[PDB]
């Protein structure tokens, strides 16, 4: 004459432990991971255009190291710099190396339009034993080593206007001879001021003749500088010697390009998120692989695991 | 846990319920059986699904950033770069811990809430033809076949039909 | 939504209710009417007003800051300045999104709570003289005119006055 | 044996607004309010913040004393506004660390210039140039003294100037870089003159670099601008043999709510504590989507266009 | 406050109850007494304790940082360092203000919830032998000595024992 | 009787606490706890972090070897405390990038100095001045060697020093700027001069500027301080014709928890992980309002003065 109706919920034999505001360890029926802590181990070729520098740093490819001639006029979305990289040319020092490296990487192109400078009265295409191309003495591909002609080095006052609608990035240098005899044998002058000037910016460099710790048996050094001329500006190179002249301008752009230092293999896959540790999925909101990221990536956190409850509390039968 | 239903008066989760999240267990002359209420199940599932859609797949795109690994020692500028990244990581780490803790707390309660809502709906549906035993079970005071038990689950239960029989059994 | 009253058993909002947020619709002998409960209405409004007091205004006063727009390209120093502001904007954007989602969830629940609290207050006041029909309506089992219904809204309802009549009708 | 019915319910609106919650992405509520300000009136209000419109002059141009900027002499401000139309009509000059000098001057918020009396003996003062023209005559920066050779001689200058005040003094000086060796001799009677502006705490040395630059206003020569700050009790020593653009006094440096903003919006007449380059915006909402650059009590910039906050219950319409 | 028990039907907090947070006050033929429900009392305490353990003692260790106070006046680098710290301090203050308000709001509700759950457990235990007066008090319709009142607190109250007496008094 | 009444209720306190919630800004609760640390002991604890009080010596002054700072030689620390009472009683010096040198030395946490033997042949070593006085006699910086002429001649200097260790060596050197040209001749017998501290990676050239500066301690001349870091396998070359303030060795650079703090708080005896310039504070509460500068396990600085967390129900007194 009576009946009983009971109401209840489900339970699983094996639940999951999650963290709540009230409890540090509470059991739930189901949960999902929110922190990605594993990587495939390799960088995917897509959808971002990767460029493997192999044995070439970004500056080495920019300057024109003989082993980096394969990177000429090349574009990228993420330049990958390998730790195995080395240089086989004249020893060079780049003031504010990070800024120039960052500036080239963000632009994302190594396009180089050769220009015709009036280097009359001086000998061009100077070479050195350190820079070797095709088993012959050579120099940086984008740099012109200006030496004396007929034991004379006339004062240089060259001009080059920016007639384009984009900024031109000029890479030039100054030679610091190790010995005073080498300074005379190459430039016929005791010291040569270099003044690369524009309508807004001006840059003057004084060569410092002195012996440096020999790298590739070269006691002398060259300092690398850059100048950016804006549309409608003109480039003036006032010099009496010791000038490592540019051969043109590099195109500077604005985009998604950047640079990453990693030794991970370049495989074939599609992963928006790229880390130095390898490409990782971007499904989870957080990651614990690397603080360095590129693309559509989860946000780096210090937590190793964070389980989000996707079910009720597991209250199994005793 | 705020409503006290999942771990409250119902302190037993039926591991045999595989067709849903919440359901019914009935006793009648015809025997004992088990059923599931899909409406209350889908209500809880959709709520949890909404939390996932707001989190999974909503990733930012950042291309060029500051240097985060330094080999040499530079000083003031390098210290600022390290401080910025560490501060950013610390703040996001706090947000991640709080979000996981907060959502999991709400997940318990919303699952607890749906259980209570199913219980309260059944009590109002039965009106005065049953009494709450206090353990999540209703003692129905009239001859209910396997049909009217389905009527309670389907919502097609007319309390007036059994009211005279039910009230007589209760108060005698 | 947690209490299941606003969209739950009362799954109908009275668009005609303009004098308050919650109320009663007295269907009785001597006609039908509608009234609004100011206590529960002002309760939810005050809570929501409290949320606005904590959000509207309270803005920071920042006079001198770093540069956030650059015409030329500089390098490391410029990159850090852009990174700092972009990181700050993303973090504040997260706080804004999370706050709105959390508060709106609380706004739904507290309004549901106030509705449910009004329903239960009415039930205990009526004691055993009425039954919950399940749709948010009480089937009062005694002849209640437009006076004693005002008494129910007034809190001045004595169940003993109608208990003998109400219990007999249910029997 | 009759009955009565009492029903309880809530209000509802015909259309309502859709808001975002923790559980659901689209839920309907009776009423809601906007939390992200994504509109501007279009003009910077003159109050309550003291605006100073630079018009044709950058802050550095007004500081140095460009002839078109003489109207800003000894002026105070809370937010200096630099216009994109600003240009220079004086000697072409270069300021190493231009951003820092612009930043600290803007933070100080004053262009007060108490003229000082240096002992410039043996040199010709108040130099003039065609590029810097006041009215229609050759002139120079108003706050700068172009010291040239006197009677074909430029004796070494080693004047002193103590800081007898309790506030730091900001001195603006410069070095002239001639385009030709003739201009170097014809102006200073020397080949190269080192400038050594030194204090009891800091020291600064600059070498002239004689060379041709791209002619700006037909001026191949350049001027390099440097600044030195002498602290209370400190002394200023200027040792030089030529190519010195001497200061005519000191600038007062302070600390306050003053700043600088780059905008091209009109300066209207209203009251708005929040100032953005897109125009002054209200500070009622907690967040804004107008500009990341702000001045005064401003809502915090976020990337969201709209963020609706529910101010009422869930809407369950009858029909 | 969501459940409406601490400030709802219970409009008086018993300042004399020093042995617990929630409890019982009874009036019977044998007199008046007071008791405490330790299960509900430990219920609120454990939940609040978990919030404290998640906050107290969990401090970060940071040794070398950026300069945060400057004696001289610099340019760009000094401005960036000040902005970084000022942004960081503002962000942490918002996290602190939001967390304190949220936890205190949850603390009010969970303490409110525990009171209501105790009330609902007692009502179901009494079945049809008592009526809710609306002020948080139950009018038991049978002679309950200090023993069976303890039985209600003990959970060992059988409504069948007093059901016949209670129903007779109610409907007469 | 035939009836009974059972009432349910909660506790209340005579004096409650006001806390802030989402709904209400001021609500009364039974009990609450403070979350913001706003008080300090007033003194820095000696433990568990190794404290080093500079007293009248700055970190750079102790590094260079000011006579009053000789007690800090080869000393290590976890937190160097710099006092505002510090002064200098030696040759006036200016350090370009002073913050960077202080930051790197403080982070290293050691003042270890391994004395090295340089080839200063042809020049007079251990130069002294009246300003730097030790034991009431003319002296100089302990870690710096003032090189003057020998027999009225200053031969060009070309010394070498390799980094044969597995750690980086920090070299501290300087350049002398004479106040008068006569002083330049009286000490170095040559007109002006150049010092070029170069390595296999870095290059640094400094030009002395002879000129009068505001004399401090009756010294119109100035000395500029520079630093060089040679990596394992690198070599240090000092090419110079005069005006060289030579190093006497190398400083060991380390990595650890060490840092620097400026405070005038006493160094007491206690155990407090948290150290602020205002003094050591407890780290029980999650937040603090004492000082933005902190060291160790410290609460996070907030702008709020007090933040009460409700540890009880709402106080509804009778
Ligand atoms: C990035 O930089 C690295 C390091 O500089 C380069 O690696 C070297 O590349 C050269 C070629 O450019 C390799 O030279 C080759 O050596 C082979 C023998 O290798 C063994 O012996 C050497 C010497 O001890 C070890 O270094 C090496 O690890 C092995 O143990 C020869 O077999 C090659 O010549 C013969 O083989 C080739 C292929 O069949 C023929 O074409 C030739 O005509 C000839 O018969 C060659 O001489 C050198 O071994 C590589 N390693 C090292 C450590 O130097 C990478 O090449 C460079 N990246 C790129 C893209 O070039
Ligand atoms: C930027 O580029 C410009 C391009 O012109 C350079 O200008 C030349 O710079 C050199 C070096 O400073 C100058 O050479 C010097 O010229 C003086 C004058 O010579 C002119 O006038 C005389 C008659 O008065 C004529 O006979 C002569 O042919 C010129 O027309 C000489 O007096 C100088 O002599 C000095 O150097 C010689 C050689 O070392 C020594 O033997 C002497 O003892 C003395 O020390 C010298 O010859 C040249 O005149 C400049 N040209 C112009 C047109 O001005 C800039 O130098 C260069 N600057 C930088 C920083 O890059
Ligand atoms: C290193 O190389 C650079 C680049 O070649 C040189 O810089 C240029 O040098 C030349 C030669 O001196 C300059 O040419 C002169 O330009 C003047 C421009 O002013 C007029 O034109 C502009 C534009 O129309 C107007 O805005 C302005 O108001 C003027 O109306 C000319 O006036 C000069 O003209 C000459 O001939 C006329 C007619 O006879 C005479 O009246 C003049 O007096 C003058 O003799 C002349 O053409 C040029 O301005 C320089 N700058 C640039 C950016 O090109 C360096 O000089 C060089 N260095 C060395 C040491 O040689
Ligand atoms: C900072 O300010 C001080 C003044 O406060 C300047 O000091 C002068 O510096 C110059 C250059 O160093 C000195 O000039 C030199 O004078 C020598 C002779 O001096 C004696 O004789 C004169 C009278 O004839 C007295 O007045 C003097 O007191 C001495 O008793 C000359 O022999 C030098 O010749 C050298 O330079 C010339 C070119 O100038 C060459 O042609 C020569 O071949 C030789 O190389 C020289 O002329 C001058 O004496 C100093 N005077 C004082 C009072 O100090 C600083 O120069 C200045 N520094 C800077 C960077 O601004
Ligand atoms: C209001 O809210 C605050 C929130 O903090 C509560 O504060 C706690 O109050 C209790 C009251 O008893 C304190 O309890 C005592 O803790 C001592 C050890 O303290 C450490 O461990 C506790 C956790 O166990 C931490 O909270 C604390 O910070 C320390 O890390 C015990 O030794 C005490 O033991 C008692 O009993 C033993 C045995 O009899 C005796 O020997 C002792 O002398 C003592 O009587 C005791 O348990 C607790 O420390 C407080 N915590 C904090 C963080 O302050 C308030 O209790 C609460 N109510 C009121 C009215 O203020
Ligand atoms: C460029 O211009 C600056 C302007 O200041 C000159 O700098 C001054 O140079 C003079 C000369 O060298 C310095 O004079 C020295 O002053 C010291 C301080 O004296 C204090 O006490 C007296 C009263 O007793 C006060 O009047 C004075 O203001 C100071 O408060 C003296 O102690 C020095 O004494 C010398 O002589 C005695 C003799 O017994 C010796 O024992 C001493 O050791 C010492 O040799 C001397 O009189 C003056 O201090 C400089 N001032 C500043 C601010 O630097 C430059 O000299 C000038 N450039 C050139 C090249 O001359
Ligand atoms: C300043 O000091 C530095 C450091 O001492 C010094 O650099 C050294 O220069 C010498 C000579 O230029 C270098 O010795 C050469 O090393 C290479 C590679 O090891 C050898 O091939 C050379 O041998 C040839 O030349 C010798 C000349 O006497 C012949 O005798 C011999 O038979 C060979 O033909 C030569 O030994 C030495 O490597 C560097 N050390 C460095 C750079 O660390 C520098 O030269 C000094 N400055 C000046 C201006 O001398
Ligand atoms: C800020 O700088 C601008 C640009 O130099 C100044 O603009 C002024 O613009 C008017 C436009 O009509 C010029 O008047 C015209 O000048 C030409 C010159 O040939 C003449 O042919 C026309 O008949 C007419 O008069 C005016 O010269 C020019 N002023 C200057 C100084 O260049 C503007 O005045 C500057 N100041 C402000 C407060 O904007
Ligand atoms: C660095 O040292 C070298 C070696 O002493 C210097 O070169 C020599 O300088 C002397 C003096 O001028 C000359 O006589 C020699 O002919 C130079 N060469 C050699 C091979 O000895 C060099 O000048 C020094 N550089 C600096 C900046 O001091
Ligand atoms: C200039 O020559 C270089 C070297 O081959 C090449 O990379 C570049 O594209 C050339 N520029 C042109 C053709 O405009
Ligand atoms: C290059 O400079 C020489 C210098 O005399 C000049 O004659 C020649 O015309 C210049 N080249 C061109 C293309 O003008
Ligand atoms: C309840 O609905 C189910 C749906 O399939 C149906 O099988 C069952 O017969 C229904 N019970 C009724 C209407 O009593
Ligand atoms: C909506 O809510 C806002 C904020 O509470 C209020 O100012 C406005 O009057 C309300 N409007 C309607 C139509 O409810
Ligand atoms: C109350 O419960 C206790 C156990 O907690 C038991 O020992 C005691 O007998 C009970 N009192 C009754 C049932 O009256
Ligand atoms: C170098 O010698 C000085 C003088 O005795 C001493 O202070 C220092 O500790 C020595 N260095 C080492 C590594 O012993």
mmCIF file of N, CA and C in Angstrom, chain A residues 231-303:
data_model
loop_
_atom_site.group_PDB
_atom_site.id
_atom_site.type_symbol
_atom_site.label_atom_id
_atom_site.label_comp_id
_atom_site.label_asym_id
_atom_site.label_seq_id
_atom_site.Cartn_x
_atom_site.Cartn_y
_atom_site.Cartn_z
ATOM 1 N N UNK A 231 62.736 57.983 -44.866
ATOM 2 C CA UNK A 231 62.392 58.455 -46.217
ATOM 3 C C UNK A 231 62.545 59.965 -46.348
ATOM 4 N N UNK A 232 63.284 60.383 -47.373
ATOM 5 C CA UNK A 232 63.597 61.780 -47.583
ATOM 6 C C UNK A 232 64.893 62.259 -46.965
ATOM 7 N N UNK A 233 65.579 61.420 -46.198
ATOM 8 C CA UNK A 233 66.861 61.770 -45.602
ATOM 9 C C UNK A 233 68.010 61.318 -46.498
ATOM 10 N N UNK A 234 69.201 61.844 -46.210
ATOM 11 C CA UNK A 234 70.394 61.547 -46.991
ATOM 12 C C UNK A 234 71.471 61.043 -46.038
ATOM 13 N N UNK A 235 72.340 60.174 -46.548
ATOM 14 C CA UNK A 235 73.378 59.539 -45.745
ATOM 15 C C UNK A 235 74.727 60.103 -46.162
ATOM 16 N N UNK A 236 75.472 60.617 -45.191
ATOM 17 C CA UNK A 236 76.769 61.228 -45.432
ATOM 18 C C UNK A 236 77.827 60.481 -44.640
ATOM 19 N N UNK A 237 78.858 60.028 -45.335
ATOM 20 C CA UNK A 237 79.949 59.283 -44.723
ATOM 21 C C UNK A 237 81.204 60.125 -44.914
ATOM 22 N N UNK A 238 81.570 60.859 -43.870
ATOM 23 C CA UNK A 238 82.775 61.672 -43.868
ATOM 24 C C UNK A 238 83.870 60.851 -43.207
ATOM 25 N N UNK A 239 84.970 60.663 -43.915
ATOM 26 C CA UNK A 239 86.004 59.789 -43.387
ATOM 27 C C UNK A 239 87.328 60.135 -44.039
ATOM 28 N N UNK A 240 88.396 59.952 -43.279
ATOM 29 C CA UNK A 240 89.742 60.079 -43.809
ATOM 30 C C UNK A 240 90.475 58.750 -43.825
ATOM 31 N N UNK A 241 89.818 57.670 -43.433
ATOM 32 C CA UNK A 241 90.449 56.367 -43.423
ATOM 33 C C UNK A 241 89.803 55.454 -42.402
ATOM 34 N N UNK A 242 90.272 54.203 -42.414
ATOM 35 C CA UNK A 242 89.847 53.163 -41.473
ATOM 36 C C UNK A 242 88.362 52.844 -41.596
ATOM 37 N N UNK A 243 87.802 52.962 -42.795
ATOM 38 C CA UNK A 243 86.369 52.788 -42.998
ATOM 39 C C UNK A 243 86.076 51.439 -43.640
ATOM 40 N N UNK A 244 85.206 50.666 -42.998
ATOM 41 C CA UNK A 244 84.652 49.443 -43.567
ATOM 42 C C UNK A 244 83.292 49.833 -44.131
ATOM 43 N N UNK A 245 83.263 50.160 -45.413
ATOM 44 C CA UNK A 245 82.116 50.775 -46.054
ATOM 45 C C UNK A 245 80.984 49.773 -46.269
ATOM 46 N N UNK A 246 79.742 50.247 -46.265
ATOM 47 C CA UNK A 246 78.618 49.395 -46.652
ATOM 48 C C UNK A 246 78.495 49.293 -48.165
ATOM 49 N N UNK A 247 77.866 48.205 -48.604
ATOM 50 C CA UNK A 247 77.623 47.961 -50.019
ATOM 51 C C UNK A 247 76.172 48.209 -50.410
ATOM 52 N N UNK A 248 75.365 48.746 -49.505
ATOM 53 C CA UNK A 248 73.951 48.931 -49.771
ATOM 54 C C UNK A 248 73.196 49.100 -48.464
ATOM 55 N N UNK A 249 71.894 48.834 -48.528
ATOM 56 C CA UNK A 249 71.016 48.989 -47.378
ATOM 57 C C UNK A 249 70.211 47.716 -47.156
ATOM 58 N N UNK A 250 69.871 47.468 -45.893
ATOM 59 C CA UNK A 250 68.984 46.377 -45.514
ATOM 60 C C UNK A 250 67.578 46.923 -45.313
ATOM 61 N N UNK A 251 66.590 46.218 -45.858
ATOM 62 C CA UNK A 251 65.204 46.618 -45.671
ATOM 63 C C UNK A 251 64.750 46.271 -44.259
ATOM 64 N N UNK A 252 64.136 47.238 -43.586
ATOM 65 C CA UNK A 252 63.593 47.056 -42.247
ATOM 66 C C UNK A 252 62.076 47.026 -42.356
ATOM 67 N N UNK A 253 61.462 46.020 -41.743
ATOM 68 C CA UNK A 253 60.023 45.834 -41.814
ATOM 69 C C UNK A 253 59.456 45.762 -40.404
ATOM 70 N N UNK A 254 58.134 45.644 -40.337
ATOM 71 C CA UNK A 254 57.419 45.457 -39.085
ATOM 72 C C UNK A 254 56.492 44.264 -39.248
ATOM 73 N N UNK A 255 56.587 43.311 -38.335
ATOM 74 C CA UNK A 255 55.771 42.126 -38.444
ATOM 75 C C UNK A 255 55.888 41.244 -37.225
ATOM 76 N N UNK A 256 55.491 39.989 -37.410
ATOM 77 C CA UNK A 256 55.476 38.980 -36.360
ATOM 78 C C UNK A 256 56.820 38.288 -36.166
ATOM 79 N N UNK A 257 57.845 38.662 -36.925
ATOM 80 C CA UNK A 257 59.114 37.952 -36.873
ATOM 81 C C UNK A 257 59.839 38.192 -35.552
ATOM 82 N N UNK A 258 60.614 37.193 -35.138
ATOM 83 C CA UNK A 258 61.404 37.261 -33.914
ATOM 84 C C UNK A 258 62.560 36.272 -34.035
ATOM 85 N N UNK A 259 63.263 36.049 -32.925
ATOM 86 C CA UNK A 259 64.415 35.157 -32.877
ATOM 87 C C UNK A 259 64.306 34.283 -31.635
ATOM 88 N N UNK A 260 64.758 33.036 -31.755
ATOM 89 C CA UNK A 260 64.755 32.089 -30.650
ATOM 90 C C UNK A 260 66.065 31.317 -30.637
ATOM 91 N N UNK A 261 66.597 31.085 -29.439
ATOM 92 C CA UNK A 261 67.793 30.274 -29.251
ATOM 93 C C UNK A 261 67.379 28.884 -28.784
ATOM 94 N N UNK A 262 67.618 27.875 -29.619
ATOM 95 C CA UNK A 262 67.255 26.510 -29.263
ATOM 96 C C UNK A 262 68.110 25.535 -30.060
ATOM 97 N N UNK A 263 68.228 24.316 -29.528
ATOM 98 C CA UNK A 263 68.904 23.212 -30.201
ATOM 99 C C UNK A 263 67.937 22.071 -30.496
ATOM 100 N N UNK A 264 66.644 22.398 -30.713
ATOM 101 C CA UNK A 264 65.641 21.379 -30.976
ATOM 102 C C UNK A 264 65.530 21.100 -32.472
ATOM 103 N N UNK A 265 65.240 19.852 -32.838
ATOM 104 C CA UNK A 265 65.112 19.506 -34.259
ATOM 105 C C UNK A 265 63.918 20.179 -34.918
ATOM 106 N N UNK A 266 64.049 20.413 -36.220
ATOM 107 C CA UNK A 266 62.988 21.000 -37.032
ATOM 108 C C UNK A 266 62.282 19.871 -37.779
ATOM 109 N N UNK A 267 61.128 19.453 -37.257
ATOM 110 C CA UNK A 267 60.310 18.416 -37.850
ATOM 111 C C UNK A 267 59.212 18.970 -38.738
ATOM 112 N N UNK A 268 58.282 18.087 -39.115
ATOM 113 C CA UNK A 268 57.125 18.421 -39.947
ATOM 114 C C UNK A 268 55.860 18.230 -39.123
ATOM 115 N N UNK A 269 55.237 19.335 -38.723
ATOM 116 C CA UNK A 269 53.980 19.288 -37.987
ATOM 117 C C UNK A 269 53.348 20.674 -38.039
ATOM 118 N N UNK A 270 52.169 20.800 -37.432
ATOM 119 C CA UNK A 270 51.458 22.074 -37.333
ATOM 120 C C UNK A 270 51.227 22.356 -35.853
ATOM 121 N N UNK A 271 51.997 23.291 -35.304
ATOM 122 C CA UNK A 271 51.862 23.694 -33.910
ATOM 123 C C UNK A 271 52.056 25.197 -33.829
ATOM 124 N N UNK A 272 51.010 25.904 -33.404
ATOM 125 C CA UNK A 272 51.100 27.352 -33.280
ATOM 126 C C UNK A 272 52.106 27.756 -32.210
ATOM 127 N N UNK A 273 52.210 26.969 -31.145
ATOM 128 C CA UNK A 273 53.083 27.301 -30.029
ATOM 129 C C UNK A 273 54.463 26.696 -30.243
ATOM 130 N N UNK A 274 55.491 27.534 -30.141
ATOM 131 C CA UNK A 274 56.876 27.112 -30.292
ATOM 132 C C UNK A 274 57.661 27.587 -29.079
ATOM 133 N N UNK A 275 58.370 26.665 -28.442
ATOM 134 C CA UNK A 275 59.247 26.940 -27.319
ATOM 135 C C UNK A 275 60.646 26.440 -27.649
ATOM 136 N N UNK A 276 61.678 26.968 -26.985
ATOM 137 C CA UNK A 276 63.030 26.437 -27.219
ATOM 138 C C UNK A 276 63.137 24.957 -26.912
ATOM 139 N N UNK A 277 62.277 24.447 -26.034
ATOM 140 C CA UNK A 277 62.233 23.031 -25.708
ATOM 141 C C UNK A 277 61.496 22.200 -26.752
ATOM 142 N N UNK A 278 60.869 22.836 -27.742
ATOM 143 C CA UNK A 278 60.089 22.120 -28.734
ATOM 144 C C UNK A 278 58.655 22.604 -28.819
ATOM 145 N N UNK A 279 57.974 22.277 -29.915
ATOM 146 C CA UNK A 279 56.586 22.685 -30.082
ATOM 147 C C UNK A 279 55.685 21.957 -29.092
ATOM 148 N N UNK A 280 54.755 22.698 -28.496
ATOM 149 C CA UNK A 280 53.823 22.144 -27.515
ATOM 150 C C UNK A 280 52.393 22.485 -27.923
ATOM 151 N N UNK A 281 51.405 21.686 -27.524
ATOM 152 C CA UNK A 281 50.011 22.025 -27.832
ATOM 153 C C UNK A 281 49.555 23.273 -27.094
ATOM 154 N N UNK A 282 48.570 23.953 -27.682
ATOM 155 C CA UNK A 282 47.999 25.165 -27.106
ATOM 156 C C UNK A 282 46.564 24.960 -26.628
ATOM 157 N N UNK A 283 46.184 23.720 -26.313
ATOM 158 C CA UNK A 283 44.833 23.465 -25.820
ATOM 159 C C UNK A 283 44.672 23.953 -24.386
ATOM 160 N N UNK A 284 45.600 23.577 -23.510
ATOM 161 C CA UNK A 284 45.522 23.978 -22.116
ATOM 162 C C UNK A 284 45.841 25.466 -21.970
ATOM 163 N N UNK A 285 45.219 26.141 -21.001
ATOM 164 C CA UNK A 285 45.474 27.581 -20.845
ATOM 165 C C UNK A 285 46.862 27.895 -20.317
ATOM 166 N N UNK A 286 47.507 26.953 -19.634
ATOM 167 C CA UNK A 286 48.791 27.198 -18.998
ATOM 168 C C UNK A 286 49.792 26.129 -19.412
ATOM 169 N N UNK A 287 51.071 26.461 -19.247
ATOM 170 C CA UNK A 287 52.159 25.567 -19.607
ATOM 171 C C UNK A 287 53.276 25.692 -18.583
ATOM 172 N N UNK A 288 54.136 24.670 -18.550
ATOM 173 C CA UNK A 288 55.286 24.657 -17.654
ATOM 174 C C UNK A 288 56.553 24.212 -18.381
ATOM 175 N N UNK A 289 56.634 24.467 -19.686
ATOM 176 C CA UNK A 289 57.755 23.986 -20.487
ATOM 177 C C UNK A 289 58.889 25.004 -20.488
ATOM 178 N N UNK A 290 58.618 26.208 -20.985
ATOM 179 C CA UNK A 290 59.638 27.242 -21.082
ATOM 180 C C UNK A 290 58.982 28.610 -20.982
ATOM 181 N N UNK A 291 59.678 29.546 -20.334
ATOM 182 C CA UNK A 291 59.181 30.916 -20.274
ATOM 183 C C UNK A 291 59.274 31.599 -21.631
ATOM 184 N N UNK A 292 60.165 31.121 -22.491
ATOM 185 C CA UNK A 292 60.295 31.648 -23.843
ATOM 186 C C UNK A 292 59.276 30.954 -24.735
ATOM 187 N N UNK A 293 58.444 31.745 -25.410
ATOM 188 C CA UNK A 293 57.375 31.217 -26.245
ATOM 189 C C UNK A 293 57.264 32.050 -27.514
ATOM 190 N N UNK A 294 56.577 31.489 -28.508
ATOM 191 C CA UNK A 294 56.308 32.185 -29.760
ATOM 192 C C UNK A 294 54.980 31.704 -30.326
ATOM 193 N N UNK A 295 54.120 32.638 -30.719
ATOM 194 C CA UNK A 295 52.848 32.271 -31.316
ATOM 195 C C UNK A 295 51.732 32.098 -30.302
ATOM 196 N N UNK A 296 50.710 31.352 -30.721
ATOM 197 C CA UNK A 296 49.555 31.060 -29.871
ATOM 198 C C UNK A 296 49.988 30.039 -28.827
ATOM 199 N N UNK A 297 50.396 30.538 -27.661
ATOM 200 C CA UNK A 297 50.995 29.710 -26.629
ATOM 201 C C UNK A 297 50.242 29.834 -25.310
ATOM 202 N N UNK A 298 50.201 28.765 -24.517
ATOM 203 C CA UNK A 298 49.706 28.888 -23.143
ATOM 204 C C UNK A 298 50.628 29.764 -22.309
ATOM 205 N N UNK A 299 50.056 30.383 -21.280
ATOM 206 C CA UNK A 299 50.813 31.292 -20.429
ATOM 207 C C UNK A 299 51.678 30.509 -19.449
ATOM 208 N N UNK A 300 52.953 30.885 -19.359
ATOM 209 C CA UNK A 300 53.886 30.183 -18.486
ATOM 210 C C UNK A 300 53.560 30.456 -17.023
ATOM 211 N N UNK A 301 53.504 29.389 -16.224
ATOM 212 C CA UNK A 301 53.283 29.478 -14.786
ATOM 213 C C UNK A 301 54.305 28.596 -14.082
ATOM 214 N N UNK A 302 54.502 28.865 -12.791
ATOM 215 C CA UNK A 302 55.432 28.064 -12.008
ATOM 216 C C UNK A 302 54.841 26.725 -11.592
ATOM 217 N N UNK A 303 53.525 26.570 -11.679
ATOM 218 C CA UNK A 303 52.889 25.339 -11.234
ATOM 219 C C UNK A 303 53.140 24.214 -12.229
#
